[PDB]
Symmetry: none
Amino acid sequence: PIVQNLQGQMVHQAISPRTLNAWVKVVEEKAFSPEVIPMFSALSEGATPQDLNTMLNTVGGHQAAMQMLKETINEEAAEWDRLHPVHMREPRGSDIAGTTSTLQEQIGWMTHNPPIPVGEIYKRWIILGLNKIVRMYSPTSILDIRQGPKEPFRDYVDRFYKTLRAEQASQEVKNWMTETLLVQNANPDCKTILKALGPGATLEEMMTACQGV
Amino acid sequence: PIVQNLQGQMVHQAISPRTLNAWVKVVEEKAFSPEVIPMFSALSEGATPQDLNTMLNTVGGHQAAMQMLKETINEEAAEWDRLHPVHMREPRGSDIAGTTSTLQEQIGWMTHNPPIPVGEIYKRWIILGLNKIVRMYSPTSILDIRQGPKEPFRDYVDRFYKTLRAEQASQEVKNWMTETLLVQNANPDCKTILKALGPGATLEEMMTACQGV
Amino acid sequence: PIVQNLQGQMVHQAISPRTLNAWVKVVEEKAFSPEVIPMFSALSEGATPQDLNTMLNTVGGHQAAMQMLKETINEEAAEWDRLHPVHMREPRGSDIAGTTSTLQEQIGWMTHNPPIPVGEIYKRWIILGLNKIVRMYSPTSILDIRQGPKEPFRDYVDRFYKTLRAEQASQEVKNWMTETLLVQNANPDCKTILKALGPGATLEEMMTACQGV
Amino acid sequence: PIVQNLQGQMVHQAISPRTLNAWVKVVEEKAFSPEVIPMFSALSEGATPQDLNTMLNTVGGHQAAMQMLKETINEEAAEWDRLHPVHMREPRGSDIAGTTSTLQEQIGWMTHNPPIPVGEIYKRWIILGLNKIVRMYSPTSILDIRQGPKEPFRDYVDRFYKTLRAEQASQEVKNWMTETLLVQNANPDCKTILKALGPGATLEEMMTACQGV
Amino acid sequence: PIVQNLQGQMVHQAISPRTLNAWVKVVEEKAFSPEVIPMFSALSEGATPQDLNTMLNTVGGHQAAMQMLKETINEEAAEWDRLHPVHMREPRGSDIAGTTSTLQEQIGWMTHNPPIPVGEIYKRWIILGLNKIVRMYSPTSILDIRQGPKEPFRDYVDRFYKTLRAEQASQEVKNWMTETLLVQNANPDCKTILKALGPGATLEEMMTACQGV
Amino acid sequence: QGPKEPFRDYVDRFYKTLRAEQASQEVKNWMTETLLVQNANPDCKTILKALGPGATLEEMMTACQGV
Amino acid sequence: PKEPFRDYVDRFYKTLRAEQASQEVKNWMTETLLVQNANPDCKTILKALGPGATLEEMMTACQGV
Amino acid sequence: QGPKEPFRDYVDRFYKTLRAEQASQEVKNWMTETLLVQNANPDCKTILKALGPGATLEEMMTACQGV
Amino acid sequence: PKEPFRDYVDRFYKTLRAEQASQEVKNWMTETLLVQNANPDCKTILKALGPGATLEEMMTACQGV
Amino acid sequence: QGPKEPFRDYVDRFYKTLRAEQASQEVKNWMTETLLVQNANPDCKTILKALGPGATLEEMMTACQGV
Amino acid sequence: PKEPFRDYVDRFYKTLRAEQASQEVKNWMTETLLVQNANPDCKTILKALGPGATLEEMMTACQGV
Amino acid sequence: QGPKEPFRDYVDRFYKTLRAEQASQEVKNWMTETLLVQNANPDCKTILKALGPGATLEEMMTACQGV
Amino acid sequence: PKEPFRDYVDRFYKTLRAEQASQEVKNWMTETLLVQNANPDCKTILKALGPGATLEEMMTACQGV
Amino acid sequence: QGPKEPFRDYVDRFYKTLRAEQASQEVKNWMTETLLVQNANPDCKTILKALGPGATLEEMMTACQGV
Amino acid sequence: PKEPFRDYVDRFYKTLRAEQASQEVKNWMTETLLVQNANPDCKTILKALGPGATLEEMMTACQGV
């Protein structure tokens, strides 16, 4: 992170040891279940690119996942260099990625007016790679999720949304999936309740109708 | 949060990374079980509206829940604008919600004399939305909770109160529910013990009578 | 808590958000099992009455438990007013409870010479209420605890002491309970080993005799 | 702990609330399993005797364990007074134990040149008492540990070493126990593999030979 | 760690008590499962050799593991003394290991220009020893890992990679192992799917082909 | 509600009981909304739940007649 | 009896094109009679819509039961 | 208490034993309150628990006679 | 024998309106005799109230057992 | 797809249905890619998955004919 | 029928060395005929490669099925 | 110890073996205390454990004779 | 044989009041003979006390076995 | 290795296969050390593991002949 | 056949004290012949030591198999 020093000038604060341990727990124990993206996004709040690379040094070891992450970062760095050609110096994609930039360059950019938020930029490329990894480690297609013959509708909704949260689908597809597939893949008793609501039903109406089904 | 700087003037302290991770754990792993409201209320102590929005950026992803939260916030923001028409400037509902206000406006209001506690105000609108979400994700009506034929009365009381804590019921209804339904839905042996106490029984008397039932 | 400011004068430090979350976890998940009293006592180290009330705002919601806590606090506040009649001003019971006192009154009392430790006083009234609540939520009388026919003696000793720790019993009764009931309620094989030690046996002798029984 | 104040003079920092809660978790939930000694040793890093007594106020409640701890501390305090007769004043055993010494005496001793490290001294007496308690609560003699007929050798080695770590045995006895009993109490198939290594085998050789046995 | 003091000069900050407790949890509870190396690497960020030795004082007790660690450190210290003969003074291997160096020597080296990063050097020797220990405590050869007849391919990939992460294999061997053994040891149905991809398949292609197999 | 009981008869039983019930009007409001659906016959209950909680008694009867 | 509801509808509206009642009557005819002359199962399903149902609602609800 | 034993007889057994018991008056207080109910016959015990712990022995006998 | 307790009460008080003892006797009559002439099960339930029971307590306790 | 149905017939069924389906072109894109493989016959599905998602319909038919 | 695919290939190419069609024909002969004259199982496996398959792909795919 | 073996005979077996055992005197001290009780016959072992670890061999034999 | 140990003790001490040996003998008589003339089970239990046992220890140990 | 196969024959099978194997010399080193023991017959494998990984092929054969 | 290995050793060395070959031969005799004349099971166990085994290794390994 970045902290105002005793002289009032902004200075680096290293990402604290037990924060990195909380990220190591998230990488090692949750096996890229979709909550890894929220927890990465949270633990890296205000992280400089040096801090973000300090976190990715423990995605290393998951060498298949790390490869997908590195190539996604490189792909986005090239796309940055394409969208923003050459005119502190303005950061190139490798400067955003914290490989070629100095720490003082990173903090300078993040503390500029207007800010050049290279940390919270690079964090988007990393989150996009983590989305690819969460897809790879997903156990099921959304089309495989069906309600158990005695499964509570809440628990099926959780299985469904947890899977949907991993999918590649655009929001327009996720809307269609929510309405059609959540109804379609319910068990026949609960499906009968859901069908009676008609196509415009909110998830609130669906679940409140199916309490104790 | 808000912290007195080295100059003695009040300044922003960002909600720390591992605090946000503790909130991500509460959203992701506890599936809007009713303890999500206490834990939100605790983790957001002294949060500015910018901090609260930083926490809600991880209710996003639970898109059905996030919709209920956004529309509840907008509903309360309109109700604020109705209850407090136009006369720092006094905050409009979108200023309470931290969308249109600056961070310095938020801290200025929260540090005024008397304080204008826009953080601990907005936190009530958020908690009201989380109550709607906790209802939606509740597994059972309070009327579905019945003591198992060999369930310890303590464990049934916990199942009952945990469900009652999710319900929409006003306190007058919750009082009636406690006295009549907790007795009514006990198993017949324990119900016989509870009935013998009469209608005025405290929960202490009920549980102390039913130890080892 | 209370912290020496940059001017050297003592000032309030708010009980930190993730400390309150650790208390919410203790209230919500451990269901007033007896370790709730140690964890309350620990998390509230150096808490002012405003801090303690900030912690009790999450016992609220457990409305039966909260009622027992409020009436125990009020009972102790009246007993304080009785034991210390009217002569900073000396704190009345409601000043100890942090309802009628200002934060500066609370810190002034806690930092006086000699100290008037209104925080670590009020914390005793709260712990006394938590003892009543731990009794109510206890699953068994100490007289119901018997060693399983193949239960290791250590595990029965833990079940016994965990229950004994919840009981109302004075220390003289707890001594008698330890010696007579721990022997009496062992299974007949282990009971035979324990009886052979005679009445003066320490718990160390009992357990070291019963390793691998 | 001890911290350099803004004037550069050393001053007390109270053992933080959530550190005490992490110790309460270790005492309450791990039932004096042998890792309680490492976790006590870690959480009490740089603790003054006042801090250490603040931690032992939650071993209280485990009244049998607390008695063994108190009498071990008193025994060591007398042994200190014997080994160091009367000549800040030099600390007596009760000054090491933080009962008769002031906080400023404790910090003065710990910050002297050479240091008089009354905290990290007293912590040894406490750890010696915790060793007695870990023995009492041990479930088995080391002689009771035998490998299951299909138990992986790693898991038996863990059961064995975890038990050995609780035993009274001197290091010379622990060496003999490791070599003879770990071989002797293996199941006959794995025992056949281990015997083939001869008496000089390292634990590395034993385990690498028994992978997938 | 190392922190800039109020005078701007760099000074020691002790590795905080609850950080050491998080390491004790990692050593005691995770039984040298391979995530112990990431968690050591994370918790020891910026650790001086005195801090690292403070962490290794709780690998002590796992006396077989501690022996492998000590001899690996001594082996690397001798190799350091060989690779860097005698010319602050330049650190010898025992100065890197923090046995013969002073704390001020350690911080002086770590804060030099260019830095002499004795902490993040010594941490490599420790991690190399932890790799030996993780091998010893590994439950299986990579050749023993086979997919269950109904095991999801994701779960077999996790079992495989978790085992591969423990192995001695160089990266060239790990590449060959990934491609040939992951295919070879799949169950015959999933193996049929994997074989159809040909030898060049990425892990992404393998897993996306085997979703719901 | 009985296993074959017409919904108009069950409504009559319910409100006839509710007049004797001694709880306050606030509780009776919650009762009329929650219990009337909860204790309905499983077929009739399935019809009623599809109306949602805002339905009037007239609408509930109009839907459930002949179920 | 067991005629698919779309076929019963087609018969009904084909007849309603022929018989010559006034518009208010034809409205009432569709709304009451299309339900009341339906198969007993279909009639039971259709009454769950109440009196406001358009034909599209009736067909999408019934599905031939 | 026996499976058919009159409560007055069980009280006589209990207090006759309590006079021989060697524990202090503090323990005997706890005994008279806790054990007398705990070891009562399950029917009689069900009557006694409904009186609550503040009941006198006279009240306990007055309630349990003829159970 | 098995008469519902409300009916036994009604018979008793209907009789107590007729027989002419003084008020102190009538008080004692309700309190002792309404219990002691009850059905044996009802009598067993009613004695659990002790001597202080009003008729409302007696009826709400017994419920016809 | 049927247990013995030729893949060209299943493709005809699928796209004939897809023309009647009322969802937007964005959804239909996702449908044509995902559902066509997902609902294929297990043998034919095994052939299709080996082509990967980038395969054209012509390639899918060319592979699955005679499966 | 059940001849191992390598032996069928060897027979085919041994024959293709003898019969005298032009190069474009020989290319088409290997590509179409080596598949179309294969055993029915082998033919089924080989068509999964499409028309671009080299002989090395054909043999490493078929493995004699 | 055998299922019927007199404790004096088991002590003779044990110490006769202990003289042949090659471990150091520190280990033999731990052996004589721990193993002698641990490997005793379950009845005899129950007698021995009640003496506690500080008992002498003479006391152990004096207690276990005729068990 | 199966006589409760308290009764055997009472017989023994009643006899020891009568027979006229000197005090050192009477001490030895209680200590050795009260054990050695006991029932074989009682004797087995009592030897577990060793020679130092007072009569109160003997009775509280034996309990009539 | 076969259930009765002489170790010299299994070594010949293994290295004859290893010459055909297309992996690099780094992989073949790991193969010769790991697989030769791992795939040995359970009796022969038990002999081989007792030699440890540093043993030469000559030592492995010298130990396993006649197993 | 089934003779305990210590007894076979004792017979062998008792004989080796008598027969008069030179020292290099006696070394080879102990090393090869003590194994090769052993019982077939013992011989199988002993070859697992290789040629370097001293008699103490041979006895502590074999244990009479």
